[PDB]
Amino acid sequence: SVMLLGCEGPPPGTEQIGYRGVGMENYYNKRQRALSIQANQPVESLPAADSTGPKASEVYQNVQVLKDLSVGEFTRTMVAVTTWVSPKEGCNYCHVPGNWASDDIYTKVVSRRMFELVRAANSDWKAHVAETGVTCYTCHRGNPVPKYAWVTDPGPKYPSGLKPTGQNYGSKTVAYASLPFDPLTPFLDQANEIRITGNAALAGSNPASLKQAEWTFGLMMNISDSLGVGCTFCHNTRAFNDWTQSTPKRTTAWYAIRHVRDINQNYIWPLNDVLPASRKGPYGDPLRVSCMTCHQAVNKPLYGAQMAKDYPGLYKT
């Protein structure tokens, strides 16, 4: 042996997706479903805060985001942001001791930007986030650094004589498959074309390359894996491009891809100058966002637990 090998027992949990007989179905491990559920547990809310009081911007010195919050509510919001992003470190993580109003430590200029990142998320991307919305926790999980944040990767080494395959390697990025190992930068950072399928049967009006097909395939494998599902979750594989035969999750995923293009482009890249080398990859690019970061292998972060509705301070205006 030639060991044998990697295997689950019967019966798997199953779900019918499409019409009977069409083959659109999903299988899953009950064990791992219960463990995943236990690991994707949400932090209970802090009691709502009364008030009825002056606005935060009236009692504090450097409040550029969480303005219209009552003092009480602001305080509540601070306690949540503390346990949510850096509970082992507490208040002092993002503040200059003795001086709550100072921005003299980077983790705060960043915290500020992330208050605008979450607010933007919950109020502008519902076609994506619905009524669950997002919170600090979604990515942080009691951690200062989202465990599942990413960076553009260079692949393994190549002598100077030859250039990288761009694909062809053992990569848990692309589900272990051999497609290209960084299908994120061109799709979840930049906004390259995913579409390769022609809309006409005969040819002469679709320049899509086979290579483009493999890149779309790699990216798709990533996506599938990050939300922890299969193509029948969003598609009808007889026609990947056919939108009417897809599931409303394809629609949601469409809007999500754009959302990650906005998080990575106008909220994370700009923070690259005030962040330390420890938070940067070999090309100087910074740890950014992907679908995994938030979903962490589940179709809805924390199995669609609704955390944000309890904190009004995470919504715009």
Binding site: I17, G18, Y19, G21, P156, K157, Y158, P159, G161, L162, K163, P164, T165, G166, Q167, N168, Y169, G170, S171, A177, S178, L179, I196, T197, G198, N199, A200, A201, L202, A203, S205, N206, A208, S209, L210, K211, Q212, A213, E214, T216, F217, C234, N236, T237, R238, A239, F240, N241, D242, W243, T244, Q245, S246, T247, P248, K249, R250, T251, W254, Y255
Partner: protein, 318 residues
Amino acid sequence: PEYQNIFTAVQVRAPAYPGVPLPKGNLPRIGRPIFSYWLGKIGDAQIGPIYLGLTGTLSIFFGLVAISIIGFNMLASVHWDVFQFLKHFFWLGLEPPPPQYGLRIPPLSEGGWWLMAGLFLTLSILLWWVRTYKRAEALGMSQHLSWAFAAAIFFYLVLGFIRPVMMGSWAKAVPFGIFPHLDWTAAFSIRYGNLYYNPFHMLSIAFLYGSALLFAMHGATILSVSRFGGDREIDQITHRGTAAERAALFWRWTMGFNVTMESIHRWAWWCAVLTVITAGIGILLSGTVVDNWYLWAVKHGMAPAYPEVVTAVNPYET
């Protein structure tokens, strides 16, 4: 109980046989034989001698060159760490020139090795072709192999050489890697709108299933009449025996008609040659003639409709 003719239960030896004599021009034969008691457990235990002419040597030569470019490239891709090479081997591969290059001969570091391995591989394959025709002539026999090999070469050429050139892009040929070439297959189907609705690929699939059906049937038959020396198909073909009779009759009583000891080999031959011949046709038309087979099938009303029980609104249209 009764022997099944699966395992030679008791074998016998005689001095190895260097074989029927070739006329002048067909060079000596090389190597001197050996017997593997285990091959012998299931088949002729004789290993070789082999023939190697100009053709054969020039083919072994080209072929090993091609295998070296592919391999060396794979070791290079994991940095000459042979451990890593061993670890990702299944995932290692030599990708093709990028499209930016079209059909031009590209730099070493960008695909030129693929074009050289592709070049040398094809030449070595077609030389092995000629080899099998020569080897088939020295014996006065016919070119049935060579017409099949020519069919399989046809598909190969269609995959990595004919379609790429027609499509004006070496990047469309298949890359050398186990898992990589698996991905090329899948990506290939995806890019051209689900290859399942491509009729030629359905026929080729009918012919592959059929090569399995025919060899399974015929093989089962011949073993079932192996008690009558039915395996000795040559003399059952010239002097029909109760083996060829019981054989043809088993099928006659089961499905109503039958063939003969000689003709079943024609059904088999044609069915194998057919896989590769529908297959190549199938690839020939992908991108050159049809770009989206699912669509093609809809245009010819072959694609089924199911109650639309699940659907998604198209964001490109909002």
